[PDB]
Scaffold this active site. Structure first.
Site, PDB file in Angstrom:
ATOM      1  N   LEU A  56       0.671  -1.166  -0.038  1.00  0.00           N
ATOM      2  CA  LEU A  56      -0.072  -0.119  -0.185  1.00  0.00           C
ATOM      3  C   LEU A  56       0.694   1.076  -0.006  1.00  0.00           C
ATOM      4  O   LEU A  56       2.137   1.358   0.470  1.00  0.00           O
ATOM      5  CB  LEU A  56      -0.970  -0.142   1.179  1.00  0.00           C
ATOM      6  CG  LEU A  56      -1.777  -1.316   1.476  1.00  0.00           C
ATOM      7  CD1 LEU A  56      -2.375  -1.417   2.723  1.00  0.00           C
ATOM      8  CD2 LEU A  56      -2.601  -1.615   0.451  1.00  0.00           C
ATOM      9  N   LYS A  66       6.578  -3.255  12.387  1.00  0.00           N
ATOM     10  CA  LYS A  66       5.628  -3.021  13.411  1.00  0.00           C
ATOM     11  C   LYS A  66       4.285  -4.007  13.125  1.00  0.00           C
ATOM     12  O   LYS A  66       3.684  -4.596  14.010  1.00  0.00           O
ATOM     13  CB  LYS A  66       5.063  -1.645  13.601  1.00  0.00           C
ATOM     14  CG  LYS A  66       6.348  -0.919  13.996  1.00  0.00           C
ATOM     15  CD  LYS A  66       6.095   0.543  14.348  1.00  0.00           C
ATOM     16  CE  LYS A  66       6.933   1.307  15.026  1.00  0.00           C
ATOM     17  NZ  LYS A  66       8.471   1.229  14.316  1.00  0.00           N
ATOM     18  N   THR A  95      -3.158  17.665  25.712  1.00  0.00           N
ATOM     19  CA  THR A  95      -3.127  18.291  24.058  1.00  0.00           C
ATOM     20  C   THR A  95      -4.560  18.273  23.796  1.00  0.00           C
ATOM     21  O   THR A  95      -5.063  18.754  22.926  1.00  0.00           O
ATOM     22  CB  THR A  95      -2.188  17.571  23.135  1.00  0.00           C
ATOM     23  OG1 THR A  95      -2.474  16.090  22.980  1.00  0.00           O
ATOM     24  CG2 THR A  95      -0.794  17.837  23.346  1.00  0.00           C
ATOM     25  N   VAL A  97      -7.019  19.072  25.260  1.00  0.00           N
ATOM     26  CA  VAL A  97      -7.540  20.473  25.468  1.00  0.00           C
ATOM     27  C   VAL A  97      -7.489  21.197  24.427  1.00  0.00           C
ATOM     28  O   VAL A  97      -6.216  21.890  24.006  1.00  0.00           O
ATOM     29  CB  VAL A  97      -7.084  21.045  26.689  1.00  0.00           C
ATOM     30  CG1 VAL A  97      -7.671  22.419  26.866  1.00  0.00           C
ATOM     31  CG2 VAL A  97      -7.445  20.286  27.884  1.00  0.00           C
ATOM     32  N   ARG A 143     -19.424  13.662  18.829  1.00  0.00           N
ATOM     33  CA  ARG A 143     -19.812  14.120  17.442  1.00  0.00           C
ATOM     34  C   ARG A 143     -21.117  14.737  17.618  1.00  0.00           C
ATOM     35  O   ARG A 143     -21.975  14.920  18.438  1.00  0.00           O
ATOM     36  CB  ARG A 143     -19.651  12.675  16.921  1.00  0.00           C
ATOM     37  CG  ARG A 143     -18.283  12.607  16.252  1.00  0.00           C
ATOM     38  CD  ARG A 143     -17.995  11.422  15.426  1.00  0.00           C
ATOM     39  NE  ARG A 143     -18.182  12.155  13.928  1.00  0.00           N
ATOM     40  CZ  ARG A 143     -17.321  12.905  13.337  1.00  0.00           C
ATOM     41  NH1 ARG A 143     -16.332  13.517  13.897  1.00  0.00           N
ATOM     42  NH2 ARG A 143     -17.653  13.272  12.096  1.00  0.00           N
ATOM     43  N   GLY A 183     -17.633  16.669  13.282  1.00  0.00           N
ATOM     44  CA  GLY A 183     -16.961  17.094  14.217  1.00  0.00           C
ATOM     45  C   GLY A 183     -17.067  18.347  14.836  1.00  0.00           C
ATOM     46  O   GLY A 183     -16.898  18.595  15.993  1.00  0.00           O
ATOM     47  N   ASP A 248     -16.646  27.587  13.152  1.00  0.00           N
ATOM     48  CA  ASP A 248     -15.928  28.425  12.537  1.00  0.00           C
ATOM     49  C   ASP A 248     -16.495  29.090  11.599  1.00  0.00           C
ATOM     50  O   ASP A 248     -17.283  28.764  10.799  1.00  0.00           O
ATOM     51  CB  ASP A 248     -14.513  27.899  11.945  1.00  0.00           C
ATOM     52  CG  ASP A 248     -13.646  27.084  12.892  1.00  0.00           C
ATOM     53  OD1 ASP A 248     -13.623  27.405  13.992  1.00  0.00           O
ATOM     54  OD2 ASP A 248     -12.830  26.412  12.450  1.00  0.00           O
TER      55      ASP A 248
END
Ligand code: NA
Ligand code: NA
Ligand code: NA
Length: 327
Positions: A56, A66, A95, A97, A143, A183, A248
């Site tokens: 891939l 791994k 993080t 936060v 969500r 999200g 946003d």
DNA sequence: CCGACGGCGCATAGC
DNA sequence: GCTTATGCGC
DNA sequence: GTCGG
């Protein structure tokens, strides 16, 4: 291809990804693990070897190693070490936060600030974004079901038309592509009075209205073209309050608007396909414009864009409806 | 082998 | 006070 | 960490 297929692998890679971003501070290592992880989550068979995943694009030598380790032992020694290092865990957790990145996380943890409680004790040591991030810690990780998104769109679109009939507001992101959840809410706004070579109040007016109908509840950042903040759908005087959401709002020149919508509607892989096809059709497309490409590769002047389809027309492509833009 | 890997609006030391 | 770099999120 | 000039 759900979780049962390669879920143990892509969680391993995602966890390595997060480790490199938040702890090692190596964003390219993070983006590689993300790349590898997403291509495996596509793959429609259970992986039986690291060599098979290596085929891939994005899986390379070390990840296949791994993958061989995890397939054989069911664990990854490297990750088990990371999980038992208390600094690596505290820094990663902090993080989460919004407003706390790898740098602030590590500073905090070096002075014994590790938990949500610790942050609460030291609100004096947080900036404004970070206090909002702390305040909504749980809410920001939930969500947003599409039926809520549709409600939120109704509120934003109607309040925007209320301020001026001539605004144009589009909710973009996966939501515009038909996605079942979201999200956050990403809103692209323009006004025919605002062009690439031409107010300081055009975004503020819309942010004000949205605050006055009590839709926007907090501001993370606001300037003349980008607003980042928090909102909440209205609750029944008698029923549980909806979770606060991230919204946003981006104000864009009218002549770069439909390139903005096309861009922030995506997906990221579709964007890559459309730009690739357009390049070898003689045009270059970025967030703001589509320009003709010269025989030596010198981009000319931006082309007039009055709709998304205008961009597909230029590059001789059949309009791809947003729902069909997954690649 | 070795550099590119996205780049920009906004909030927040050094002169 | 003014400018730049950097962190952060997207 | 992977890729490609
Ligand atoms: Na490969
Ligand atoms: Na964060
Ligand atoms: Na984060």
């Amino acid at each position: 291809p759900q979780e049962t297929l390669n879920g143990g692998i892509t969680d391993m890679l995602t966890e390595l990804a997060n480790f490199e971003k938040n702890v090692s501070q190596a964003i390219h290592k993070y983006n590689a693990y993300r790349k590898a992880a997403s291509v495996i989550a596509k793959y429609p068979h259970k992986i039986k070897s690291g060599a098979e995943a290596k085929k891939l694009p994005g899986v390379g030598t070390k990840i296949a190693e791994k993958i061989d380790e995890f397939l054989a032992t069911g664990k990854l020694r490297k990750l088990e070490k990371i999980r038992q290092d208390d600094t690596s865990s505290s820094i990663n957790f902090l993080t989460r936060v919004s407003g706390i990145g790898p740098s602030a996380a590590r500073k905090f943890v070096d002075e014994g600030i590790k938990t949500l409680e610790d942050l609460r004790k030291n609100e004096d040591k947080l900036n404004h974004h970070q206090r909002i991030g702390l305040k909504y810690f749980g809410d920001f990780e939930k969500r947003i079901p599409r039926e809520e998104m549709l409600q939120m769109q109704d509120i934003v679109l109607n309040e925007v038309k209320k301020v001026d009939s001539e605004y144009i507001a589009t909710v973009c992101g996966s939501f515009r592509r038909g996605a079942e959840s979201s999200g956050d809410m990403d809103v692209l706004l323009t006004h025919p009075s605002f062009t690439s070579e031409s107010q300081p109040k055009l975004l503020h007016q819309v942010v004000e209205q949205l605050q006055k109908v009590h839709f926007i509840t907090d501001t993370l950042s606001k300037g003349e073209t980008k607003f980042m903040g928090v909102c909440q759908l209205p609750s029944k005087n008698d029923e549980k309050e909806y979770p606060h959401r991230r919204i946003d709002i981006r104000l864009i020149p009218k002549d770069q608007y439909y390139c903005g919508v096309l861009y922030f509607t995506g997906s990221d892989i579709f964007n890559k396909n459309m730009r690739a096809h357009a390049l070898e059709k003689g045009f270059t497309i970025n967030e703001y414009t589509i320009r003709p490409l010269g025989v030596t590769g010198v981009a000319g002047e931006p082309l007039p864009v009055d709709s998304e389809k205008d961009i597909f027309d230029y590059i001789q492509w059949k309009y791809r409806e947003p729902k069909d833009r997954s690649e």
